[PDB]
């Protein structure tokens, strides 16, 4: 199962020139293009090997369209200051995402487009790709504007067409990197904790893609509560790490089993300390 997403963030800096703009693209968890207005010569640049086969006409158009985007979003920051009655004193952030998911197989499974202002949902294209959800009365203005301009019909055409076409291409081009499954290396650690208890921590390391399910069971029963599960984190080499921990009575450690599910495993692993 696979996805393409573009993201952008426009960040104002009062009295220090125009807002900063970044834009980036991903296939699954892999970044493949990036633009930063803070660069000496801002342009869309490659971030994965498999996109480097695209020619100069590609990079020039992506660059051209992203600069346009930057300028539009700098205006949008001004408009939103107006909607929310905000002064020129403080910095604000406007974030955007667009993308498409494939399941199996070939055509669009779900399209997305969404904006956030100052860290909160603002306006989103509904799953129907025909209507919009506004978070408040300011976003209701933007919605009415999107309706009058027939934006959804345009965005639907991109999502059902261009987005899916190019995701397919990148997945093929980057097939060795993007269509792989590297199973986690797993183990459990044990440490006493005070009051006749111990922490059992189940580790998963070096896996790709990031999706994984770590579950603790006592006596073969999934422990929902009381499990600490860390956020999946990058190793820095293109793989991921995660752990899950449970605190158990000393003398009862053997009654606990960790269960790891990942696409790269032939079958789910069970581990017991």
């Amino acid at each position: 199962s696979h996805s393409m997403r573009y993201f952008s963030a426009a960040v104002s800096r009062p009295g220090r020139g125009e807002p900063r703009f970044i834009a980036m693209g991903y296939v699954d968890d892999t970044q493949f293009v990036r633009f930063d207005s803070d660069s000496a010569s801002p342009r869309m640049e490659p971030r994965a090997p498999w996109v480097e086969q695209e020619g100069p006409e590609y990079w020039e158009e992506e660059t051209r369209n992203t600069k346009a985007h930057a300028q539009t979003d700098r205006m949008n920051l001004q408009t939103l200051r107006g909607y929310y009655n905000q002064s020129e004193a403080s910095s604000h952030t406007l974030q955007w995402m667009i993308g498409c998911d494939l399941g199996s197989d070939g055509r669009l499974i779900r399209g997305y487009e969404r904006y956030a202002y100052d860290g909160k949902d603002y306006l989103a294209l509904n799953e129907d790709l025909r209507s919009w959800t506004a978070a408040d009365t300011a976003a209701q203005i933007s919605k009415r504007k999107c309706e009058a301009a027939n934006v959804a019909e345009q965005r639907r055409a991109y999502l059902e067409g261009t987005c899916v076409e190019w995701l397919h291409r990148y997945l093929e081009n980057g097939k060795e990197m993007l269509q792989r499954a590297d199973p986690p290396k797993t183990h459990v650690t044990h440490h006493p904790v005070f009051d006749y208890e111990a922490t059992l921590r189940c580790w998963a390391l070096g896996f790709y893609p990031a999706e994984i399910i770590l579950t603790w069971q006592r006596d073969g029963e999934d422990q929902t509560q009381d499990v600490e599960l860390v956020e999946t984190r990058p190793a820095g080499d293109g793989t991921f790490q995660k752990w899950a921990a449970v605190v158990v009575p000393s003398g009862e450690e053997q009654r606990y089993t960790c269960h790891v599910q990942h696409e790269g495993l032939p079958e789910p692993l069970m581990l017991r300390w």
Binding site: Y6, E62, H69, Y122, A149, Y158, T162, W166
Partner: peptide, 9 residues
């Protein structure tokens, strides 16, 4: 590939 158009809020 990015979309070609970006819209006004």
């Amino acid at each position: 590939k990015l979309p070609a158009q970006f819209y006004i809020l």
